[model samples]
Target: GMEEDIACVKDLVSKYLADNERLSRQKLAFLVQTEPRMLLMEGLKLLSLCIEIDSCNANGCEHNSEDKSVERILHDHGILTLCFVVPDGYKLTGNVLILLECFVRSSPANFEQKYIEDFKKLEQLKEDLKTVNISLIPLIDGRTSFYNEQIPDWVNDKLRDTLFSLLRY
Candidate 1:
């Protein structure tokens, strides 16, 4: 069932990414407002695809027209706002962090310096998330060594390894 659900979500993402017509975009935004979590995960996956599209291209930073449209669709649907809205203690919190980071990383450093700056803000937001006492130790580790400075001294390895590890994507 999970696999089927995943496939369905993937298919929906692909369809919307391909068209991004007004109706399709409106449906996606409606999903965000009506069924946030499912759409959030699927939308994040689509956003990741946009990032990969640019990274794999020869230019490695410039998005093609379709890619740009998908980017706009995701943003226009409030996915960026969802990044902040997802509760820190939600079971999908790790997923949220990882997806948000991926979304930020998807932007090209050349023309999308704003995303980079936004990434910094997200990093600080992670600090605020620490106050919630959610276990993030499991998300931290070698893959996320960069987060060492941001992690609290008191957080043991359990929360560190998992919570911050979400960003490893």
Candidate 2:
């Protein structure tokens, strides 16, 4: 039953994002706020999907209405704070970071005006990761490491691709 539920939510959110129909922002916010601990990561995944859809649709279309709706949900629901506070062990950290990066890029002016504290929190998280010698590249790969680990060439390449885009602020 839980598996069905998970599949249902995934399909629903994915379809909603694909613009089959618009789901209410309140409902989406409620999903994140009240989701079980076991489901929180999936909720993040869903939110990421929502962001991706708003930022870029299947046809590579950008819709102002979609972006504004998503920006409102994310900002009003304190999702950025949730992203900052969620433990590192959760696989959703990188997704959260990527979503934030997308938000910043979508409208740097609005993001700065509204979410400056979240930006600072992200910077602090970056520094904390650096102090522990964790390269953000692994984070994008859904792995986290402290101390020296041999980053393979492929991972290095992936890091190079995302780091400049995601960390440019």
Candidate 3:
């Protein structure tokens, strides 16, 4: 019975991580598809989780008994993509704090509408992450995409390294 419960948790995590990964690969898609209001709304809900896990605890990782269980639960399953991309701004006060929280509290059971709402917040945070101006009123092609690419060298480099590091652990 205990094994089955644990297996169920693992199985659910596998699915959510997969869903998160698929959405993450196409960051641009989220910007176009979702509404800003939705993103802001969801952020309020999910960001709390990020504060708890990331602020109080680092990446949900625990320093106990030399075990890598925390790292393994959140990192080893290919979901760290979300964390790697989480900008420093978001880590501090942007839209991504929810994502950090959910990653730590990840579970199949936890993947309900509230969780999805939280996840969607991450997508919106990407827009907020941009330090450059993007016109909201004009349909004209703007510098939003260009601005995103111009992220700080340190942030971009760390983001890339984090993304690549996931492949290893």
Candidate 4:
């Protein structure tokens, strides 16, 4: 069980980081075929994790100039969205994918330093996620749908592979 958890966390985090290019893409809609996917709870839990980490004093040995209060930044970046991005309080919520998508839309951090810092934070977050044991089906429902399906088939294969590689990094 322990080893399984580690492997899954490794795989999931790998998938997540690797998916960032798409994660940050604007105007892309991740189709919601099934309506029963209750990702709000998981999204909110992710927000809680951000806030919990933000409350800490250390910056995890990162660059000193990095704006370490990323949870606050996320709160300002909006919280929920299946597609459209809007400024609706943006408090931390239970959806990781939503949080990321919202961040992509509202904040749009393509700046080099910002991206590096954010990526570092993402890596740290992934490591933390590895410690928790939970079901991935619901969480991965919409998130990994396009990932596994490789919608475009040909064009997306390389993209998907790169994404998975980033997750492992």
Candidate 5:
């Protein structure tokens, strides 16, 4: 039903999202649970949302500074555990890696909680992951041609995020 008209509302959507953190964390918990959660598709989608949120925070917008939701996403939402549990391959493993970078990107407290073995496997994932475009890079970019200049902005930042995650930068 159209409330006023068949039109889109901006703040209503953003306002809804602003309050959706708790609901978002609930979704993260489901993905990190044991097996039989072939429902891992939504897991990827939520992680992507976390990725964007993490980016926004890092971009220096502290509009909602007191909200600890984004900071605790890994620590409280079992996301760190998702990193341990998810297997390498298709899309599920993809965001797990990106979220790992999310850790190094921010969320400083959770870093101390991770083990040295964790970082080692971060490297191992690079060795073990068979695909780059789907897992390492988000490719809606035109890779249809052969040229280094064809590299998308996201492609490079995630590389730095990867590099940054490895304790270098």
Candidate 6:
């Protein structure tokens, strides 16, 4: 049954890739509505599996085509739509964020993606979390997401200091 379920998702992804960006977003929207939790969770999880090395020890290399799907979805900003549009499911939303981490960690060059705002907004999104799994907040603290693990402590600290200087009244 799991094999069949994965096949079903593989089919959605194949069709998604064949479509244009706009169409795929609309399709993803509709698909999200139809299946709710399962569709989005599995979709995000699969994206993470694709865009990252499966396990640091296993080092299972994924294919270029799978990576392309992940990048293309990012290019369209579709994943963010799935994340914020359907607010209220922290588990699913967390997977969405995790998939994003996978995207950036897949290649240091992906730091150009400007995903910081998403994490930055988490401060505000925490409002909705009010009394729930705020644990997801820690997911953003990993260094890989900031400067892709190559920078020292002072790097983000410097950036923060620069912002602080600009905002001083």
Model 4 scores a TM of 0.20
Task: Give the winner by lDDT: 1 or 5.
Answer: 1
List model 1 lDDT by residue over 19-41, tens digit each: 53422553354235324354445
Candidate 3 weakest lDDT stretch, 10 residues: 138-147
Query: In angstroms, how far off is 155's CA in candidate 4?
Result: 38
Rank candidates, TM-score, best first. Answer: 2, 1, 6, 5, 3, 4
In each prediction, how many residue pairs overlap at the backbone (N, C-alpha, C within less than 3 A)? 20, 0, 1, 11, 0, 0
Q: Quote the lDDT for 137 in model 5.
A: 27
Local accuracy of candidate 5 as per-residue lDDT tens digits, 48-130:
44443444344332222233332243344344421342311112342442422222213434444443444454555554333
Angstrom error of the Cα, residue 2, model 3: value is 28
Off by over 4 Å in 5: 1-17, 21-110, 113-117, 130-169
Error of 3 at 64 (Å): 24
Cα lDDT of model 4 by residue, 35-75, tens digit: 11222223223322222232221212112123324343344
lDDT of each: 0.35, 0.36, 0.30, 0.29, 0.33, 0.35
Report the C-alpha lDDT of model 6 over 117-148, residue by residue, as the tens digit.
54554555545433343223323322233232
State, as a TM-score between 0 and 1, how close model 5 is to the true structure.
Answer: 0.23
Judging by lDDT against the true structure, name the best candidate. Answer: 2
lDDT of 2 by residue, 1-169 (tens): 4445445554454443333333345335524542354245444443444443433342233333333432243444454322233311111232332223233233556545535654454555655454433333211111122111222334333323332332333
Tell me the TM-score of each prediction against the true structure: 0.25, 0.26, 0.22, 0.20, 0.23, 0.25
In model 4, which regions exceed 4 Å deviation?
Answer: 1-98, 101-110, 134-169
lDDT ranking, high to low: 2, 6, 1, 5, 3, 4
Runs in model 2 deviating more than 4 A are: 1-49, 52-83, 86-110, 137-169
Q: How far out, in Å, is residue 18 in model 1? A: 4.2
